[PDB]
Amino acid sequence: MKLCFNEATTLENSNLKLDLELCEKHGYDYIEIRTMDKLPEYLKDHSLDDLAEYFQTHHIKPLALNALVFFNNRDEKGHNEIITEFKGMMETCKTLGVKYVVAVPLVTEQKIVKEEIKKSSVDVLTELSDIAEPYGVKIALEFVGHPQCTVNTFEQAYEIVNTVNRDNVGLVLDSFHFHAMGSNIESLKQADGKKIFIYHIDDTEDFPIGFLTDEDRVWPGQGAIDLDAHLSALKEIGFSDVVSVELFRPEYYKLTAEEAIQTAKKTTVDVVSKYFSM
């Protein structure tokens, strides 16, 4: 199983250029590039071609572009924003050799029935799938374990992915998100491992579901998530490609970029290697 670094981990104490240098130095196989801040920042004094050249001449590679944000249940205008950004991301993926694009569900205060959320999500993901085919890029739907996210549990997200029924549409299983709204481990054990595109590892302070937010995450193994169960389930259903470490804790931004990157690697490897050869 390969090791990936998610830039949220060093959101406030690093940049893409430095993340690349340090992740490469510390043996990471992949990096998830953030499109809302890190990439634009990098492009202020660098070209996409420069970045493509970096990946061509180093071991590390870009696993995914992080988050096409709030893709479902949008009005005509919002849908246009979503499709326009996705099309732009396809060109970025092509230039950099990016394998996946992470899709994040709409976060809203509005109550929408689950079948309306499912129909919209399925329709949009199918449209995104159609667009992605000529690029060979795959979409990974990341359900978010937040009480205001329209798709906040594993089974709800899995139902959507299965209904879309496309080889280029799968899931991002994030341990924190799975734990944060109480997803059922039995549902994961009954899932098709091939539909799990990316696995995000992290842990959390033990607050009740509903109260948990991303700032509550802690290093893998230092929290209350039943990571033993998550890892055991992933192994049982055949998933084993890659694990990416993603943190949003203010405390860790106090560390240097390298300390954070090295700690993210040690905690992750020490936990994951107990189930998977790395």
CATH class: Alpha Beta
| Alpha-carbon Rg, integer | 18 Å
Q: Portion of residues in helices?
A: 40-55%
Structural class: alpha/beta
The main sheet orders its strands as 1-2-3-4-5-6-7-10
Q: Return the CATH topology.
A: TIM Barrel
**Gap between N and C termini, in Å?**
5 Å
Give a quick account of the main beta sheet: strands, pairing sense, barrel closure: 8 strands, parallel, barrel
What's the helix-strand series?
Answer: EHEHHEHEHEHEHHEEEHEH
Give the total of beta strands: 10
Description:
40% of the residues lie in helices and 18% in strands. It has helices at residues 16-25, 38-42, 48-56, 76-96, 114-132, 154-164, 175-180, 185-189, 227-236, 257-272; strands at 2-6, 30-34, 61-69, 100-104, 138-142, 169-174, 196-201, 203-204, 217-218, 242-245. The chain is of the alpha/beta class and 278 residues long. It has a single domain, classed as Divalent-metal-dependent TIM barrel enzymes (TIM Barrel). The longest helix has 21 residues, at 76-96. An eight-stranded parallel barrel has the order 1-2-3-4-5-6-7-10, surrounded by five helices. A two-stranded antiparallel ribbon has the order 8-9. Strand 4, helix 5 and strand 5 form a beta-alpha-beta unit. The protein has ten helices and ten strands. It catalyses: scyllo-inosose = scyllo-inosine. InterPro entries: IolE/XylAMocC-like, Xyl_isomerase-like_sf, Xyl_isomerase-like_TIM-brl. Belongs to the IolI family.
